[PDB]
């Protein structure tokens, strides 16, 4: 099993860990901030997914410094993760294209 597939697998596991830790820590950052909506675990988890995929729905977002710090890590993990799957598919196609010219 090639590096690029191990890495994509790793990045998926690591992103799901980031989405759960992020759920938990967003609620922990945002409770105590009057007006905050990112304060129960289930919608925190939905929030973490729409943040990682950079969907920017705009139904939920953090209003505190530590919530926003948590948000930044989730976004970076999401963009890296999905970038790494792209790199992995590039490698696969470059390989399949070497072979298809008998290199």
């Amino acid at each position: 099993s090639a590096l690029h597939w191990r890495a994509a697998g790793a990045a998926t596991v690591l992103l799901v860990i980031v989405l759960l830790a992020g759920s938990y820590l967003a609620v922990l950052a945002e409770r105590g901030a009057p007006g905050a909506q990112l304060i129960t675990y289930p919608r925190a988890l939905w929030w973490s997914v729409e943040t990682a995929t950079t969907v920017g729905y705009g139904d939920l977002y953090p209003v505190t410094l530590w919530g926003r710090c948590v948000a930044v890590v989730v976004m970076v993990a999401g963009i890296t993760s999905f970038g790494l799957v792209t790199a992995a598919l590039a490698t696969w196609f470059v390989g399949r294209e070497q072979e298809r010219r008998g290199h």
Partner: antibody
Framework: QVQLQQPGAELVKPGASVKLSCKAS????????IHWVKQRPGHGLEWIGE????????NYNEKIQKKATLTADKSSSTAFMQLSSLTSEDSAVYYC???????????WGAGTTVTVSS | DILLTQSPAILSVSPGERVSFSCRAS??????IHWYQQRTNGSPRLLIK???ESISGIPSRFSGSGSGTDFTLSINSVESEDIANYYC?????????FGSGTKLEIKR
């Protein structure tokens, strides 16, 4: 089972403080928040504050004079509320309740009647 | 902070009749409203969560409806054991807040 056990009563001299206890049983999660709610006789429910025992962070009602300090003992599954410098304004039933981090008080203690009097 | 208005404060009904308790939020809170029953000398008891969801242990007689700002807890065919104060509570925005309460009173 009784999920939340509170002492029936505390008498407190005016000016003095008191620690209320709240010993939890049944399922405990990392996610669990313990809340405290004040009810004066013939009056409604007043949210005082919350603590997350797994991390020990606490938040308080801004809109009222801060009387309370919340702590928890991870090992003995007990949450504490230190009410300090009481007056007759502070005479009330104090409920503890458990929230699974999903927004609603699944279960309440039976409440501690706190009387401030000489 | 979200204000929950429960008007009227007292609701009189005859035995076996249907009754509706109102809860109005000062801004939209979707379906993040939960309802408690508190009998005389008793602690609160969760009846309905997220505006409409059953709790096991609660008579089918109880139901909830509403979204946004206007929420209703209903009892089809009231009976004596329903005599209590009924409170609403929001979890949309920090901090959680309670309605001022509505007493049910039966005219027998």
């Amino acid at each position: 089972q009784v999920q939340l056990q509170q002492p029936g009563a505390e008498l407190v001299k005016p000016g003095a403080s008191v620690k209320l206890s709240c010993k939890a049983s049944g399922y405990t999660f990392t996610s669990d928040w313990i809340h405290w709610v004040k009810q004066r006789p013939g009056h409604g429910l007043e949210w005082i504050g919350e603590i997350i025992p797994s991390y020990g962070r606490a938040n308080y009602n801004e809109k009222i004079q801060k009387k309370a300090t919340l702590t928890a003992d991870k090992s003995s599954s007990t949450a504490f509320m230190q009410l300090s410098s009481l007056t007759s304004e502070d005479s009330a039933v104090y409920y503890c309740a458990r929230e699974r981090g999903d927004g609603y008080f699944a279960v309440w203690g039976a409440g501690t009647t706190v009387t401030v009097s000489s | 902070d979200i204000l929950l208005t429960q008007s009227p404060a007292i609701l009189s009904v005859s035995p076996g009749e249907r009754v509706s308790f109102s809860c109005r939020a000062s801004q939209s809170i979707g379906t993040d409203i939960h309802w408690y029953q508190q009998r005389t000398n008793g602690s609160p008891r969760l009846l309905i969560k997220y505006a409409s969801e059953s709790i096991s242990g609660i008579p089918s007689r109880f139901s909830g409806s509403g979204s946004g700002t206007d929420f209703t807890l209903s009892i089809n065919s009231v009976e004596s054991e329903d005599i209590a104060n009924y409170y609403c509570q929001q979890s949309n925005r920090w901090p959680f807040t309670f309605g001022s309460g509505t007493k049910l009173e039966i005219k027998r």
